[PDB]
């Protein structure tokens, strides 16, 4: 947006106006890494309680 | 006689070695093999061949 777009003029004076540009603002999306920690699935503990592993 | 070289029958060596003979009846033994049987084939790398174990 740019900040000074309407000016108050005098018509009566011919004073010069610092000339303007537009510029351009960048939006942004951050990647976000999880996972999940190593779970122990022995086979043992499932076989010894008679459970599929 | 069903005689067995099993460890279990054999206690000590020379003078302290003693031998240990079952008399079992009918049923007197009972293995119930679970069927809990697992196993696991882990290759691996990093060698001049794949190292495989079981």
Same mark, same amino acid.
């Given at each position: 947006?740019?900040?000074?777009?309407?000016?108050?003029?005098?018509?009566?004076?011919?004073?010069?106006?610092?000339?303007?540009?537009?510029?351009?603002?960048?939006?942004?999306?951050?990647?976000?890494?999880?996972?999940?920690?190593?779970?122990?699935?022995?086979?043992?503990?499932?076989?010894?309680?008679?459970?599929?592993? | 006689?069903?005689?067995?070289?099993?460890?279990?029958?054999?206690? #000590?060596?020379?003078?302290?070695?003693?031998?240990?003979?079952? #008399?079992?009846?009918? #049923?007197? +033994?009972? +293995?119930?093999?679970?069927?809990?049987?697992?196993?696991?084939?882990?290759? #691996?790398?990093?060698?001049?061949?794949?190292?495989?174990?079981?």
């Amino acid at each position: 947006k740019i900040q000074g777009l309407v000016r108050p003029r005098d018509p009566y004076s011919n004073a010069d106006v610092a000339a303007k540009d537009l510029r351009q603002l960048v939006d942004n999306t951050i990647k976000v890494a999880s996972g999940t920690p190593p779970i122990n699935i022995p086979p043992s503990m499932l076989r010894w309680i008679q459970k599929n592993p | 006689i069903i005689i067995t070289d099993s460890p279990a029958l054999v206690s #000590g060596a020379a003078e302290t070695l003693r031998h240990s003979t079952l #008399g079992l009846t009918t #049923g007197a +033994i009972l +293995i119930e093999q679970n069927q809990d049987f697992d196993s696991t084939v882990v290759d #691996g790398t990093g060698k001049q061949n794949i190292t495989r174990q079981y």
